[PDB]
Amino acid sequence: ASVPSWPQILGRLTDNRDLARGQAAWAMDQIMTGNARPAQIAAFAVAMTMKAPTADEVGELAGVMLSHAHPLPADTVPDDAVDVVGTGGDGVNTVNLSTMAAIVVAAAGVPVVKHGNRAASSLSGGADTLEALGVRIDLGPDLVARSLAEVGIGFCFAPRFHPSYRHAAAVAREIGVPTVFNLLGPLTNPARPRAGLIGCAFADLAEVMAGVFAARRSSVLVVHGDDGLDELTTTTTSTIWRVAAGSVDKLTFDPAGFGFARAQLDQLAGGDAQANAAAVRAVLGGARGPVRDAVVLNAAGAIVAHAGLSSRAEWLPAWEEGLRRASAAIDTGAAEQLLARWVRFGRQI
Amino acid sequence: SVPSWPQILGRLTDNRDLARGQAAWAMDQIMTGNARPAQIAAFAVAMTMKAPTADEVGELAGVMLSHAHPLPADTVPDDAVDVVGTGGNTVNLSTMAAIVVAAAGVPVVKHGNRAASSLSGGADTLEALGVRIDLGPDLVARSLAEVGIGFCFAPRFHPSYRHAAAVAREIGVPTVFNLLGPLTNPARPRAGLIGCAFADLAEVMAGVFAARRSSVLVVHGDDGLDELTTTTTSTIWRVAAGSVDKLTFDPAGFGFARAQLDQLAGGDAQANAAAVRAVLGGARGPVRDAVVLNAAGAIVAHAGLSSRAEWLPAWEEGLRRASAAIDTGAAEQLLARWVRFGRQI
Numbered sequence: 001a002s003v004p005s006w007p008q009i010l011g012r013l014t015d016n017r018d019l020a021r022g023q024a025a026w027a028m029d030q031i032m033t034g035n036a037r038p039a040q041i042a043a044f045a046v047a048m049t050m051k052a053p054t055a056d057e058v059g060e061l062a063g064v065m066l067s068h069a070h071p072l073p074a075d076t077v078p079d080d081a082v083d084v085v086g087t088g089g090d091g092v093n094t095v096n097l098s099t100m101a102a103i104v105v106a107a108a109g110v111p112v113v114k115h116g117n118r119a120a121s122s123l124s125g126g127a128d129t130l131e132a133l134g135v136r137i138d139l140g141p142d143l144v145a146r147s148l149a150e151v152g153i154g155f156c157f158a159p160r161f162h163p164s165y166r167h168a169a170a171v172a173r174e175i176g177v178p179t180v181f182n183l184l185g186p187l188t189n190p191a192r193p194r195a196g197l198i199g200c201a202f203a204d205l206a207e208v209m210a211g212v213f214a215a216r217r218s219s220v221l222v223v224h225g226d227d228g229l230d231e232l233t234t235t236t237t238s239t240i241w242r243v244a245a246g247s248v249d250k251l252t253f254d255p256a257g258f259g260f261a262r263a264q265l266d267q268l269a270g271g272d273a274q275a276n277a278a279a280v281r282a283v284l285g286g287a288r289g290p291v292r293d294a295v296v297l298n299a300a301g302a303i304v305a306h307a308g309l310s311s312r313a314e315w316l317p318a319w320e321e322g323l324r325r326a327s328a329a330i331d332t333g334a335a336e337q338l339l340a341r342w343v344r345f346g347r348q349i
Numbered sequence: 350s351v352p353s354w355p356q357i358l359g360r361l362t363d364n365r366d367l368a369r370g371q372a373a374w375a376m377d378q379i380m381t382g383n384a385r386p387a388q389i390a391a392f393a394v395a396m397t398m399k400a401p402t403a404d405e406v407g408e409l410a411g412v413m414l415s416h417a418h419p420l421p422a423d424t425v426p427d428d429a430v431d432v433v434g435t436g437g438n439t440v441n442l443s444t445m446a447a448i449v450v451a452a453a454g455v456p457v458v459k460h461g462n463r464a465a466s467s468l469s470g471g472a473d474t475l476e477a478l479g480v481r482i483d484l485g486p487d488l489v490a491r492s493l494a495e496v497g498i499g500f501c502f503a504p505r506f507h508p509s510y511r512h513a514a515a516v517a518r519e520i521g522v523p524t525v526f527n528l529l530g531p532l533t534n535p536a537r538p539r540a541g542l543i544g545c546a547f548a549d550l551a552e553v554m555a556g557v558f559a560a561r562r563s564s565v566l567v568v569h570g571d572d573g574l575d576e577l578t579t580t581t582t583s584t585i586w587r588v589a590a591g592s593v594d595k596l597t598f599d600p601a602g603f604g605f606a607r608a609q610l611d612q613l614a615g616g617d618a619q620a621n622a623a624a625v626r627a628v629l630g631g632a633r634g635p636v637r638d639a640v641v642l643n644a645a646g647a648i649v650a651h652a653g654l655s656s657r658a659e660w661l662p663a664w665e666e667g668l669r670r671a672s673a674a675i676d677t678g679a680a681e682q683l684l685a686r687w688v689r690f691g692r693q694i
Contacts, residue, residue: 010522014397039390039519046391049362050398174387176355177362 006030006040013047024048024057028064032164041171045179052204053180055211061180062187062212068164069190076145077191080309081111084302085124085186086199086230087209088178089269093119094231095126096270096279097294098199099133100335101326103284104299106153107338108329110306113148115156115189119273122172123158123165124185130155132277133339136346143349144191151342154191161190187212195219195309197302199230203239210241210248217246219308221301226252227265232298234263234290240301244308255297258323263290284336292330299326354378354388361395372396372408380416380509389516393524400549401525403556409525410532410557417535418506420458424490425536428654429456432647433469433531434544434575435554440471441615441624441636442576443544444478445680446643446671448629451498452683453644453674455651458493458536460501464618467517468503468510469530473618475500478625478684481691488694489536496687499536506535523547532557540564540654542647544575548584555586555593564589564653566646568598572610577646579608579638585646589653600642603668608635629681637675644671 001008001020009023019027027044030036036044048057084102086094106112116126127137138157139147148154158165172181183205186198195218200206203224210222222241225233232238234255242249256262267290270276283292300322307318329335352374360367367375375392378384384392396405432447434440451457461471472482483502484492493499503510517526528550531543540563545551548569555567567586570578577583579600587594601607612635615621628637645667652663674680 007521010394010520014394014522014524016398037519038386039516040521042387042390043394043520043522046358046362046394047398050364050395171387174385175358175391176388177358177391179362 006036010040010043010047013044013051016051018051018054019057021056022060024060025064028061031168032064032068034167036167038167038171041168042175045168045171045175045181048180053183053208055208055215058180058183058187058208059212059215062184065162065165065184065188066190066192068162069188070141070161072141072145072191076149077113077193078111080195080306081113081148081191081193082302082306083114083186083189083193083196083198084112084298085114085116085126085196087124087182087185087201089201089230090228092269093125094199094229094268094270095129096276097231097268097291097298099126099129099276100280100283100295101197101299101302102153103280103339104295104326104329104335105302106151107334108299108303108325109152110303111148112153113144113156113189113191113193114154115158115161115185115191117158120173121158121169122179122181122184123162123169123188127157128273129276129280132273133280134343134346136349139349146349147342147345151345152338153342156190158185162188183209195305197298197305198222199298200224201228201230206239207241207248207250210243213243214246214248219244219305221305223301229265229268231294232301233268234260234294234297235265235268236262258319260293260297263293267291268294280339284330284339286331296323296326296330299329354384358388358391358395361392361399364399366399366402367405369404370408372405373412376409376412379513380412382509382512384512386516386519389513390520393516393526394520396525397523401553403553403560406525406528406532406553407557407560410529413507413510413529413533414535414537416507416509417533418486420486420490420536424493425458425538426456428540428651429458429493429536429538430647430651431459431531431534431538431541431543432457432643433459433461433471433541435527435531435546436470437546437573437575438464438470438615439544439574439576440474441621442613442639442643444471444474444621445625445628445640446542446647447498448625448684449640449644449671449674449680450647452679453648453670454497455648456493457498458489458501458534458538459499460503460530460534460536462503465518466503466514467524467526467529468507468514468533472500472502474621474625477618477622479688479691481694484694491694492687492690496690497683498687501535507533528554540650542643542650543567545569546573546575551584551586552593552595555588558588559591559593562591564650566650568646574610574613576639577642578613579605579635579642580610580613581607589658600638603664605638605642608638612636613639625684629675629684631675641668641671641675644674
């Protein structure tokens with residue numbers, strides 16, 4: 001078990017056994033060093049999924065991946081930097097909402113460092129919508145570092161930071177269905193921010209994700225809409241896994257308690273890049289309604305997660321602080337301004 | 350029934366049985382070169398981990414057989430048998446038992462490949478005995494008429510499965526594809542002794558056979574051999590009249606002494622050939638026992654085609670015929686005729 005091989009690992013997996021410590025790691029390190037055949041890649045990716053990954057296993061996959069990633073330059077990522085992202089819906093996305101909450105959070109003064117890919121890739125999306133807004137998404141360590149210090153936000157394009165993952169990515173594309181690899185995006189942010197709002201379509205995988213962040217002592221809300229959204233929803237309650245101090249705390253959450261009127265799922269989903277970018281422009285310019293509401297809400301969440309790093313402040317007041325700051329970042333036009341600053345940045349860069 | 354790979358792989362990774370026809374579509378894509386290696390691999394693995402149904406594996410085998418080169422019309426006797434394991438190898442045992450069964454006058458048509466393939470092995474041992482393994486449909490048919498035995502070389506009869514085969518080799522562990530060898534014999538014999546190393550899947554295998562109205566014994570040694578063992582009991586799934594009957598078989602019931610697993614499994618293709626020669630030549634020992642035993646079973650499966658159909662007396666007949674086929678020199682001589690046949694074609 002501690003002297004690993006592909007047949008040993010896949011066989012343990014096809015036998016529906018949890019992997020021994022280090023096996024997932026060695027599996028990933030092979031795939032990352034060019035020493036795995038496409039069939040071994042696919043077979044590992046698929047079996048890992050069906051067996052039901054563990055926090056340990058996923059943790060090992062994400063760690064190995066980070067060990068090969070390009071870092072950001074030393075001391076350029078603030079210690080309180082946050083991520084805002086969903087691992088993607090069934091065939092759906094909410095990158096409209098997560099893009100808008102990313103921007104709202106940054107404008108409120110919290111450093112946001114994102115990580116993603118263009119659509120229909122196992123590393124999370126978001127790249128295309130940002131490109132449709134005019135954001136230069138493909139920047140090296142140094143300029144992402146500069147973007148984050150100059151604008152208050154940066155985006156780590158996965159192709160650029162995880163080149164050694166190309167083989168896994170191409171295989172993820174051909175399999176053309178979500179695997180355990182689809183979990184990796186929020187756990188493989190190269191800037192390694194210690195906090196975030198992390199949205200997930202699947203409750204079981206969400207709790208495995210909560211577990212991975214807990215081992216890292218991150219302050220994160222892993223959020224699943226009980227309507228299935230990979231975000232805090234306003235159509236109904238959400239489940240939150242509150243990661244903090246190295247433990248997970250599963251909560252039911254309801255935005256009505258904060259004055260959010262109920263909405264209908266299909267008002268929220270989002271669409272392709274151009275569609276998302278029009279709604280970003282619309283909402284950041286003051287368009288009221290349920291999309292805005294969900295953005296303010298998920299931006300609050302990220303802000304609460306931020307609160308959890310250097311504080312053990314109360315749940316309810318941290319949320320009230322979250323909603324006010326997020327609301328004000330939109331209504332003052334600071335979020336709209338931040339996007340135009342973000343767009344100018346790429347063109348001066 | 351308007352299928353696609355994301356639809357099939359998503360349903361599989363959801364732990365769901367496929368809808369009727371999806372496995373066939375997936376296999377048919379795999380066989381006509383239209384599947385990506387990653388898709389082949391994912392299908393094969395997902396299918397395994399979900400637990401394949403008899404319908405599913407039936408559809409896979411059905412599709413393979415619809416793409417295969419057939420033997421010429423009227424060249425495979427109605428009662429021809431297969432003698433084969435899915436592989437663990439007992440190629441030593443299946444080979445000898447094959448030759449024994451043929452010598453006793455039951456027509457044998459085998460199907461295999463060289464070592465480690467997902468479609469069964471066995472062709473290395475035969476090459477080593479001087480048997481010509483790479484014969485087209487017409488010469489296999491004639492071997493079967495003249496010699497009493499034929500061997501269908503997988504590459505030769507399932508050329509479109511080369512994409513699946515290679516992916517099988519690459520992922521390097523058993524999957525549902527490891528069942529297909531015994532179910533895709535191009536000569537389509539209706540009876541046989543079918544060894545399966547994986548106890549879970551043996552039953553699924555039996556189901557496929559039954560759906561096709563075969564008379565087979567799917568056998569799994571309770572020590573893990575994909576033949577009837579003599580080290581302990583075996584599980585037999587007895588296929589007949591379209592139904593499956595699960596029994597435990599004990600060789601002690603027929604006076605077979607207990608062996609030890611090291612004494613029984615095979616080895617090198619040269620090593621297997623040497624043992625083939627010793628056993629057909631009269632060597633007594635655990636290997637001979639296991640051979641007699643596996644031929645008997647094939648002859649029992651044969652009996653079972655035409656519904657005389659009584660278990661014990663079928664087995665004492667089977668056992669007499671096997672032992673006599675070795676003891677009279679008929680098995681030794683049959684192989685020599687097989688070797689001579691290839692030399693003169």
